[PDB]
Amino acid sequence: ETILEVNNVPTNATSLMERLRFPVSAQAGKGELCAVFRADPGRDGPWQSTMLGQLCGYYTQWSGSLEVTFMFTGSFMATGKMLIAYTPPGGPLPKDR
Amino acid sequence: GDRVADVIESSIGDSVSRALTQALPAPTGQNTQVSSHRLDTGEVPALQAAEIGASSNTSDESMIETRCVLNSHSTAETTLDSFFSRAGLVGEIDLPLEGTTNPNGYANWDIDITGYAQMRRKVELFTYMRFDAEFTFVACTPTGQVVPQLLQYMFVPPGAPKPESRESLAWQTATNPSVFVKLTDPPAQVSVPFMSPASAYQWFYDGYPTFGEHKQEKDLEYGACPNNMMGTFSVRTVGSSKSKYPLVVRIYMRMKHVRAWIPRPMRNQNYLFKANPNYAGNSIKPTGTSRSAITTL
Amino acid sequence: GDRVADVIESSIGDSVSRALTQALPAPTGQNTQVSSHRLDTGEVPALQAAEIGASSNTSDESMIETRCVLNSHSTAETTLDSFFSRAGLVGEIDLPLEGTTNPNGYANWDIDITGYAQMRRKVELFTYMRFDAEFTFVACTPTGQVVPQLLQYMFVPPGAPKPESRESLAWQTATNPSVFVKLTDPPAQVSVPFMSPASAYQWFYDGYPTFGEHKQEKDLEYGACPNNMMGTFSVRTVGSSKSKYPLVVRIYMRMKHVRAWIPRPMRNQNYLFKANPNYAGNSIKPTGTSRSAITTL
Amino acid sequence: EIGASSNTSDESMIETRCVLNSHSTAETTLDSFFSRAGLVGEIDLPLEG
Amino acid sequence: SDRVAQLTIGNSTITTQEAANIIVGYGEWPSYCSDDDATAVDKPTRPDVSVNRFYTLDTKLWEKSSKGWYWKFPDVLTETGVFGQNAQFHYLYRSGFCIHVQCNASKFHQGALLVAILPEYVIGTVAGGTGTEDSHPPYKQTQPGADGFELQHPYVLDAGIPISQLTVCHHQRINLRTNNCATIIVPYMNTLPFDSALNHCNFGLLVVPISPLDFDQGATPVIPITITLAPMCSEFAGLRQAVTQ
Amino acid sequence: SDRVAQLTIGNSTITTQEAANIIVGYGEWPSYCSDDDATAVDKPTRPDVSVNRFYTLDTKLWEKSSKGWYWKFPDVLTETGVFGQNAQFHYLYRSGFCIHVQCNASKFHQGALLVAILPEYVIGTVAGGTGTEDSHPPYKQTQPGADGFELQHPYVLDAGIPISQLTVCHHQRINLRTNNCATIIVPYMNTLPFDSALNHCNFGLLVVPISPLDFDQGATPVIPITITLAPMCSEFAGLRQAVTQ
Amino acid sequence: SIWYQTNYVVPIGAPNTAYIIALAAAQKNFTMKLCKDTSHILQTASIQ
Ligand SMILES: CCCCCCCCCCCCC/C=C\[C@H](O)[C@H](N)CO
Ligand SMILES: CCCCCCCCCCCCC/C=C\[C@H](O)[C@H](N)CO
Structure with missing residues (x-):
């Protein structure tokens, strides 16, 4: 299990460690959107920061399942819930939950 | 897990392929048996119904008076490994000195065997084909003259970085397969495996490969099977400076271990473009030759 | 008919009702066993979690020091055949001489036992009930006086032609069941079967009975179960001329062979209409009685 | 935080079917990944220089 | 060994660490109809994983002065999914x-x-x-x-x-x-x-x-407050055109 | 004993008195996928009578100067029914x-x-x-x-x-x-x-x-001329929102 | 995608914003095929 750079927004050298963790905050409870990322490892994006996305670059055709493993680094007294949806192909970017 | 009767007596989940037919060994042509006159009613084998769509089961033992003819003629030359295991020009790359097409001593060629009419028309008799291949490169000057020159034939699979120049970085061939050859030596020759993500190639893809709102701009994607884009073939004159001989690389593909599915009508009009069943409209040639009348020859 | 493994190992079509519970015989109340002091850790039966939604399994053998009490108290009076087999006024029909409600010597009464509060509140403890019944008609003058008069009690099932008058045609009772009685005789009494198209009556129907665009005009159909419209009950003074005694028919329904499903909260507000769980809004009475404070009584 | 990876299969997360996988692991070996010649060096022997 | 629960039906999953337990209503697990209780002769379709899965309806805000909310079933799943x-x-x-x-x-x-x-x-x-x-x-x-x-x-x-x-x-x-x-x-x-x-x-x-x-x-x-519900052992029968209400 | 045919699949039926016969294409009857040919691990739904039935598309007028018509499959059944x-x-x-x-x-x-x-x-x-x-x-x-x-x-x-x-x-x-x-x-x-x-x-x-x-x-x-077609041994897999094209 | 189901609830005195770390891997059924040269990394010249 290697770190996925979902938050690949920051570009300058002083903020390249902000790229490994994405935030969750207090919202108004409308079912907002936190983050979305494509599930293509050999593609150019978050998976290029993995040992799967660097070794699948040395190969052309892949098969089998994946697994993303999210970890919460907030307080102990904090609680909450998240929906982590895999939208198969054809589905555009979902507009709501 | 099954209690109701409308799931015990169900034909749901039958995975076996219920076949009506059975492949029988036919090493020779069929022998003819002796036949005499028939003058009976009800037995009428000359009368068929093609509306059924099936072909005639009529033998010549039923239509004429025949003799015994032990046929020892073989069916071994109509097989596919005897029909496709014959090398043909699938591509041709030119490496001029001065020009515009490839003036930098390198050339890339997207792998398609749908660029020469005489080899396209054979594979397009079937719609799915699964084969290992055997490529053969025949390098020479335009004048046919052979020269003392070294070349690099790099296979660039899809996604791998395409070489932009003669002195580029991709030519180091750490994982991409490459072949070095001198023009004075015999032609190179490599055997390729079946390299598709699917179970078979397909020369006709009835559909669009991506999703999305299909408009006039993104229309050229119709018919593109990306299971068939097997990559890119690249050539350079191995060197840091420009060459002094113009070259022409010819590629000859032979199939082996062939399998094929779902035959098709074979074409009769002249091809015009690659991976495109287009034709000319005002000049629609008939399949054959004309006559003056139907009663005369 | 089953080849794949995702249909052999399927729990599709399981028709058996997997029950966690088992009905055990409980003819008497539960006997108490002897209990002594406990001074241990881990065993803590007084602590429950009602967040689980289940009730407490705490006995008094676990909370106090108890004695053996062989309880021989019966549970036979809390059954449904002991709780519903008690006749009550479900309806009341009046046959005046001069008036406006029923001035022609005949009266129709749509069968609903949701017209008197004291019998409605018992059946509306459950939402599905299946029962045979036993009706009993108690005819009399308004003054309680009994008179020498003959009557006809016709049961008109749904679809059958309702009688429009005293001298109508439907009173010939060729297929409709009817009962003739004199007022001097004892009350009539008939046993009715379970007559529903369904498996049980239901006093609450959450939904509309027809399809269609549900608007403000056709709103009163909300809550109408047509599985429960068992018909119409009709009365006349048997004769060609007008009577000379005013009458009042009272109907008393006793259930037997009762079964019931899915208990409900019992009502606390005063009913207002028939087959309608409406209530008054400004006058919402609490379930019980008030106090001055919580520490005082 | 244990540092070990997930032991979670897809038989535990979704409703799955039997898929007899006959895909080989023979191309991820090291003799299949390193037995591919590459340019490690390049020497030049000019006349004047 | 009881506060944690994982509910996997279909292609959906719920993971909880502060559960109470699972209540089975009236001691009965959902089932399919038997040959005795059924009267319709038409064969029913049993879409086993496309409708039997969790659907998330909406979110309600609990405030100080919240009086309550009700949802009728299966009115909630008439414009949502293959169900x-x-x-x-x-x-x-x-x-x-x-x-x-x-x-x-x-x-x-x-x-x-x-x-x-x-x-x-x-x-x-x-x-x-x-x-x-x-x-x-x-x-x-x-x-x-x-x-x-x-x-x-x-x-x-x-x-x-x-x-x-x-x-x-x-x-x-x-x-x-x-x-x-x-x-x-x-x-x-x-x-x-x-x-x-x-x-x-x-x-x-x-x-x-x-x-x-x-x-x-x-x-x-x-x-x-968030409601999340799954059909279970669903069956449909009697096929005609599409009507909303 | 051959000119008459009755095709009953699902809740639909065709009766014909001037039939030729029934052609089974390439000697193969339709079937469901095996555990070896399949690669998707998700369970497929098999709606057995709601989509496996006859659908009638349109009617084409044969005239003297009719050149021909073509229909692509299953483009014809993307806005028609439960299929x-x-x-x-x-x-x-x-x-x-x-x-x-x-x-x-x-x-x-x-x-x-x-x-x-x-x-x-x-x-x-x-x-x-x-x-x-x-x-x-x-x-x-x-x-x-x-x-x-x-x-x-x-x-x-x-x-x-x-x-x-x-x-x-x-x-x-x-x-x-x-x-x-x-x-x-x-x-x-x-x-x-x-x-x-x-x-x-x-x-x-x-x-x-x-x-x-x-x-x-x-x-x-x-x-x-009238086209009437029935899916047979249908299977679906991979469930997400609705898209027309 | 990742969607807030309910919300991120926090008491007084604790920080109002958290962070999530995603970790990606593969299963036992994963396979690769047809070795090539990696494309998403380059090299400017004049090495040493
Ligand atoms: C050292 C050089 C080796 C060159 C090997 C090239 C790889 C060839 C792969 C197999 C080619 C099969 C032909 C495939 C189909 C064509 O692209 C057609 N256009 C498909 O419609
Ligand atoms: C000779 C006269 C015989 C009269 C017999 C009348 C038939 C009675 C049938 C059973 C009645 C059960 C009560 C049914 C339910 C009520 O209509 C409720 N309003 C249902 O919500």
Whole structure:
């Protein structure tokens, strides 16, 4: 299990460690959107920061399942819930939950 | 897990392929048996119904008076490994000195065997084909003259970085397969495996490969099977400076271990473009030759 | 008919009702066993979690020091055949001489036992009930006086032609069941079967009975179960001329062979209409009685 | 935080079917990944220089 | 070994660490109809993983002065997914359910919710208040959809019946100091083995705060409630064109 | 004992008295995918009677100067029924088919139709006529729906291939003096065990009059052709929201 | 995609914003095929 750079927004050298963790905050409870990322490892994006996305670059055709493993680094007294949806192909970017 | 009767007596989940037919060994042509006159009613084998769509089961033992003819003629030359295991020009790359097409001593060629009419028309008799291949490169000057020159034939699979120049970085061939050859030596020759993500190639893809709102701009994607884009073939004159001989690389593909599915009508009009069943409209040639009348020859 | 493994190992079509519970015989109340002091850790039966939604399994053998009490108290009076087999006024029909409600010597009464509060509140403890019944008609003058008069009690099932008058045609009772009685005789009494198209009556129907665009005009159909419209009950003074005694028919329904499903909260507000769980809004009475404070009584 | 990876299969997360996988692991070996010649060096022997 | 639960039905999953338990309604697990209870001769379709999965409806904001919300079933799933298309195209329907109510809050928040399942929950009106007008509720209030409808008189549940005796039904509590989820499993409850989904709502889900939500200033004020429900052992029969209502 | 046929699949039925026979395509009956050919691990839904039934698309008028019509499959069933909703909601698809073409006429009418099934029937253009413009067909002509599209050059089938060699495919004739129906059964033909229904059309149905319709004045001039088709052994997998194309 | 189901609830005195770390891997059924040269990394010249 290697770190996925979902938050690949920051570009300058002083903020390249902000790229490994994405935030969750207090919202108004409308079912907002936190983050979305494509599930293509050999593609150019978050998976290029993995040992799967660097070794699948040395190969052309892949098969089998994946697994993303999210970890919460907030307080102990904090609680909450998240929906982590895999939208198969054809589905555009979902507009709501 | 099954209690109701409308799931015990169900034909749901039958995975076996219920076949009506059975492949029988036919090493020779069929022998003819002796036949005499028939003058009976009800037995009428000359009368068929093609509306059924099936072909005639009529033998010549039923239509004429025949003799015994032990046929020892073989069916071994109509097989596919005897029909496709014959090398043909699938591509041709030119490496001029001065020009515009490839003036930098390198050339890339997207792998398609749908660029020469005489080899396209054979594979397009079937719609799915699964084969290992055997490529053969025949390098020479335009004048046919052979020269003392070294070349690099790099296979660039899809996604791998395409070489932009003669002195580029991709030519180091750490994982991409490459072949070095001198023009004075015999032609190179490599055997390729079946390299598709699917179970078979397909020369006709009835559909669009991506999703999305299909408009006039993104229309050229119709018919593109990306299971068939097997990559890119690249050539350079191995060197840091420009060459002094113009070259022409010819590629000859032979199939082996062939399998094929779902035959098709074979074409009769002249091809015009690659991976495109287009034709000319005002000049629609008939399949054959004309006559003056139907009663005369 | 089953080849794949995702249909052999399927729990599709399981028709058996997997029950966690088992009905055990409980003819008497539960006997108490002897209990002594406990001074241990881990065993803590007084602590429950009602967040689980289940009730407490705490006995008094676990909370106090108890004695053996062989309880021989019966549970036979809390059954449904002991709780519903008690006749009550479900309806009341009046046959005046001069008036406006029923001035022609005949009266129709749509069968609903949701017209008197004291019998409605018992059946509306459950939402599905299946029962045979036993009706009993108690005819009399308004003054309680009994008179020498003959009557006809016709049961008109749904679809059958309702009688429009005293001298109508439907009173010939060729297929409709009817009962003739004199007022001097004892009350009539008939046993009715379970007559529903369904498996049980239901006093609450959450939904509309027809399809269609549900608007403000056709709103009163909300809550109408047509599985429960068992018909119409009709009365006349048997004769060609007008009577000379005013009458009042009272109907008393006793259930037997009762079964019931899915208990409900019992009502606390005063009913207002028939087959309608409406209530008054400004006058919402609490379930019980008030106090001055919580520490005082 | 244990540092070990997930032991979670897809038989535990979704409703799955039997898929007899006959895909080989023979191309991820090291003799299949390193037995591919590459340019490690390049020497030049000019006349004047 | 009991506070954690994983509910996997279909292609969906719920993971919870502050569970109470799983209530099976009336001691019955959902099932398919038998050859004896069934009367329809037409073969029913049993889409086993495309409709039998969890659907998330909406989110309701619990405030200090929240009186309650109700949702009618399966009105909530008539415009949502492959369930709400097989039902528009078919005339019959038979499914259990597995409801799951989420309300996460801190250890400095306090409150409770009664999450009850009332079968055949007919809706009344105040009848003009005085009790003299024979009124009936509109259609947006009897079958309100996935958005739900807010109880205006929760003490009588807008039906004349009390909230105190509702614990005779299926129920769980959501006590924010013990748990944040309530899993109720409901079989098919009706007199008929198959019934229409667009006209008849078999039961109603009631979410009522008995104890009001209280917290101190500085904490998180927005505390949502979220309903997540799964059909189970669904069956459809009688196929004709599509109708919404 | 052969001119009569009754095709009962699902809740639909066809009765014919002037049948030829039933062609099973390439000697293969439709089936469900095996555990070896399948790669997707997700369980597929098998709606067995709600989509596996006959659908009637449209009616085409055979005239004296009718050149031909083609329909792509399963583009014809993307806005029609429970098939065209499970397919919009799922990403994969796998079904055989049973096509049935009706053309009834008298015993004083004469004509013939070739009813052929051409797999992977890619569509070409005349390329400006002169063969110099690299053109491609529009979307209404490649996936034309249930209305079909009229062949403008039937001799080359709008693909450069001849109509004479089309009898190597599945085919029947409709000879109005012998028969008025053509039943073709088609298995799933593709390199992939499952494939998308909204992007890939597996085969095309061609209806071409070889012999023109002729009749004498006074008879019935309006002679329709009617396509009626049934999925068979359908399977769907990979469930997400609804997309039209 | 990742969607807030209910919300991120926090008491007083704790920080109002958190962070999530995603970790990606593969299963036991994963396979690769047809070795090539990696494309998403380059090299400017004049090495040493
Ligand atoms: C050292 C050089 C080796 C060169 C090897 C090249 C790889 C060839 C792979 C197999 C080619 C099969 C032909 C494939 C189909 C064509 O692209 C057609 N256009 C498909 O429609
Ligand atoms: C000779 C006269 C015989 C009269 C017999 C009358 C038939 C009675 C049938 C059973 C009645 C059961 C009560 C049914 C339910 C009520 O209508 C309620 N309003 C249902 O909600």
